[PDB]
Design an enzyme around this catalytic site. Structure first.
Site, short mmCIF file in Angstrom:
data_model
loop_
_atom_site.label_atom_id
_atom_site.label_comp_id
_atom_site.label_asym_id
_atom_site.label_seq_id
_atom_site.Cartn_x
_atom_site.Cartn_y
_atom_site.Cartn_z
N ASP A 131 0.37 -7.56 1.96
CA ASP A 131 0.70 -6.33 1.83
C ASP A 131 2.13 -6.17 2.11
O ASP A 131 2.86 -6.01 2.93
CB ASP A 131 -0.02 -5.16 2.99
CG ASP A 131 0.27 -3.72 2.83
OD1 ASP A 131 0.76 -3.53 1.93
OD2 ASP A 131 -0.09 -3.08 3.76
N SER B 87 4.63 3.21 7.89
CA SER B 87 4.10 2.12 6.86
C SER B 87 5.28 1.70 6.26
O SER B 87 6.27 2.21 6.03
CB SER B 87 3.01 2.55 6.12
OG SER B 87 1.76 2.02 6.63
N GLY B 88 5.42 0.39 5.88
CA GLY B 88 6.46 -0.07 5.30
C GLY B 88 7.39 -0.57 6.02
O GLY B 88 8.63 -1.40 5.73
N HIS C 152 0.75 -1.24 0.01
CA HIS C 152 0.08 0.04 0.04
C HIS C 152 0.87 1.34 0.00
O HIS C 152 0.28 2.26 0.01
CB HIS C 152 -0.99 0.17 1.10
CG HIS C 152 -0.33 0.55 2.51
ND1 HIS C 152 -0.04 -0.51 3.29
CD2 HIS C 152 -0.14 1.79 2.96
CE1 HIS C 152 0.61 -0.01 4.70
NE2 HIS C 152 0.58 1.42 4.29
N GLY D 53 2.86 7.46 9.19
CA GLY D 53 4.26 7.69 8.50
C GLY D 53 5.10 6.22 8.64
O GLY D 53 6.36 6.25 8.02
#
Ligand code: CA
Ligand code: CA
Ligand code: CL
Ligand code: CL
Ligand code: NA
Lengths: 223, 56, 223
Positions: free
Chosen positions: A84, A177-178, A40, A175
């Site tokens: 994801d 994410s990943g 995402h 912020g």
């Protein structure tokens, strides 16, 4: 990262920042040419920034490498956030040193109760908005699959796990994410989603990396 | 509180759910909001109603 | 049922009407004491109405039997509608005849392109609201997994299949839920959900019954 602590400069050498004019997601360096992030987080024109601490000041250890190719997982489900995970290839190989180092992929899935390190440049407030500039860190245990589904009935798949504290107060946030979830020196999770930040009964949900080692290895070997 | 992709069960009453993905989607008109932690965030509302809102 | 036809009295002897003061769902008789329906049709105080044609007139072939026990599938997901199947036990065994007969469970899953019979007392209008009183029937083919997921990206599980027409005009609708999808004399589907009724590129989604024969058999054997 809500309720965490300042990691210290370059103490998380596998943490990368994804920049498209601003920090929009985090990522994990798995070798000199590949970064693992969340599907995402995909967008065009990604610049991978390695060796970062203060993302708003060039401090002398950064490596800014543009992405040559982004590969979203073939079964990524943007509706349910299942699968994801995303691979990002660097236009040039990074210089692996003490402040820029790869993180190992897991050979086995982690168990519930394992303490893990979650890091990122995400919002530090559960109620409000305050974005840090230096990397923040958080030590959080992996929650049982049963309690994860109990927090989010009907939304947890076999490719997700919860981590954090059901009493709230400590969690990842907007912020992050990943970013990495590292347990026993292995990249076990990817910052995925949640309901608010650090809320009671709303722990963060993370992509279960150990279910993708096969796809990760074959993809980078052919790209 | 619009909604463009509404899925309902075929029962009486129907059980409907909005599958829209928005960069806010966390209205007070949504009881359960789920967001990714990205910038911007991708949020979905998993509330179950017996109706569908108008489109956007 | 939208775009269908009048079945004819008692020509679908396994079709059931679930009544809680009014018709709210359909169902399928699988033996003299058990009915298969959709899990989202669950409510207390269910009365099972067999031998029905006109659901508003006592015509002389009906059997009204109260539900003694309802068993929602243990993994039913009300958010994603995965495992949307429910067993209803009759308070007393129904007497089987030509107008009240059980439908066979599948030995193997049906393939795409197989013509099936879908029936129910649901709404007959795609844009409007007109509920019939006699049973309506619809012959519809099973659609491929690819086209089903293409219509509803990120929402078709391995326990669902689409049936109908991508051009619209023929579909199941509100009131058909829990009803049968019978292919080659086997109960292969349960009317589950959809996006509207008879809409272009929005075919009906149905519970894949063949993935539940083991659970159905063991549950009724121990209840
Ligand atoms: Ca810097
Ligand atoms: Ca009647
Ligand atoms: Cl409907
Ligand atoms: Cl079971
Ligand atoms: Na009985």
């Amino acid at each position: 990262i809500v309720g965490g602590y300042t990691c210290g400069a370059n103490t998380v050498p596998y943490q990368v920042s994804l920049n498209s004019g601003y920090h929009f997601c985090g990522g994990s360096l798995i070798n000199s040419q590949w970064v693992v992030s969340a599907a995402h987080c995909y967008k065009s024109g990604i610049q991978v920034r390695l060796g970062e601490d203060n993302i708003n000041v060039v401090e002398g250890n950064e490596q800014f490498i543009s992405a040559s190719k982004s590969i979203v997982h073939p079964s990524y489900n943007s509706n349910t956030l299942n699968n994801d995970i995303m691979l990002i290839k660097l236009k040039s190989a990074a210089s692996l040193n003490s402040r820029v180092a790869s993180i190992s992929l897991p050979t086995s899935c982690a168990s519930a109760g394992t303490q893990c390190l979650i890091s990122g440049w995400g919002n530090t407030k559960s109620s409000g908005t305050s974005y840090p500039d230096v990397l923040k860190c958080l030590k959080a245990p992996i929650l049982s699959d049963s309690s994860c589904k109990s927090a989010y009935p009907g939304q947890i798949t076999s490719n997700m796990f919860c981590a954090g504290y059901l009493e709230g107060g400590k969690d990842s946030c907007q912020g992050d994410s990943g970013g990495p979830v590292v347990c026993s020196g292995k990249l076990q999770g990817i910052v995925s989603w949640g309901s608010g930040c650090a809320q009671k009964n709303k722990p963060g949900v993370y992509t279960k990396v150990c279910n993708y080692v096969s796809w990760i290895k074959q993809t980078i070997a052919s790209n | 509180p619009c909604c463009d992709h509404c899925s309902c069960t075929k029962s009486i009453p129907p059980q409907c759910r909005c599958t829209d993905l928005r960069l806010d989607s966390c209205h007070s008109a949504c009881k359960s909001c789920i967001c990714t932690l990205s910038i911007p965030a991708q949020c979905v509302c998993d509330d179950i109603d017996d109706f569908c809102y108008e489109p956007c």
